[PDB]
Amino acid sequence: EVSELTESSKKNVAHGLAWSYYIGYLKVVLPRLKECMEEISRTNPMLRA
């Protein structure tokens, strides 16, 4: 029964989109943000504020 329930629903796309977005983009671009912004913060006082 549980196997048929998993197979039949072809529209459970939310979990797939969430995990795909996470692994593909956020796990690889998020950590290198503070270091990428500090260099601009060195010359722009507005970002430093």
Add this chain to the structure above:
Amino acid sequence: SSPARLLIPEPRAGRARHAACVLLAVCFVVLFLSLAPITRRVCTQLAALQLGVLLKGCCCLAEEIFHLHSRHHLWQVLCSCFPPRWHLALLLVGGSAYLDRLALTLSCLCQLLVLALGLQKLSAVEVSELTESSKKNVAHGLAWSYYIGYLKVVLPRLKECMEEISRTNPMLRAHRDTWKLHILVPLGCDIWDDLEKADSNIQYLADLPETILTRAGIKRRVYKHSLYVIRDKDNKLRPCVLEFASPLQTLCAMSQDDCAAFSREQRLEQARLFYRSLRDILGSSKECAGLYRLIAYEEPAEPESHFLSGLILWHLQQQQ
């Protein structure tokens, strides 16, 4: 407080069991107010209600006999069809039989008539709970995301890319019936970054540099595909356009994470389901009518150093 307003549906608190328990306590309290042989009738009715799941399991195994070889390969089929909480049902049936067959006949008649008519179905609450409780069903989402993001934007623009490639070197102009992108989807999760290293007979022929640029999350289109040359036997050489499935790398990275708690058997099942979903999605499409050929293989137990090359050569031969 908040300019907007959100009502996030937090999951069920599971207080239905508490309501059932308090109702049962109320029933016991009522029975206390205002006898012994009625326990036999209660047990017989419990056995009559329990034999329904036994009938359902028998029917399920009768239907799963053909899928036995494909999924379970004899004990596994009956283990899957029958819920493990069935020994007490057999005990109740045996006790009812020993205590006493018209009653059993009418009880089983009613049970299997209800089962066959299919008037007992699932309401919205339980199906929604099952939908939102199974956290790991990324197969369909990954298939749809892959198709929309990649396969619906580069497959139509495949004739012109290879046309300029053939303009650069007319070698692949001779082969015109194999002008479609080949996709490799191993049922495991291993992915080779240097496909020339996976097999000794696969060698590059043309790979022009290209930069993949994303501006605020918007990915730029890909205008180049890597052309290869699979060495046949000492008769000729054949070119190809080869790719791997990024969602399989997604499954691999999911399995690597500790917080995901994603195992190996689940990974295999999800990979097979993703393969089936992608095949069914591409089968009923229009833009990608015949501009693709996806190859699914399971790595063999015996060590073969030229397995993939032979498989793709066979796919090319049937392609012709």
Add this chain to the structure above:
Amino acid sequence: HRDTWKLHILVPLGCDIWDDLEKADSNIQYLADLPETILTRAGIKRRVY
């Protein structure tokens, strides 16, 4: 300040050039420096904006 809307050019009669002009004198400090990439395609330099 509207009457000082013109580019200033420093030409020392020697040849010393400071890469960080904020370090040449203690009273010169940045106010705005947005990132920009200088691209030359086959010797053709892109305009500076």
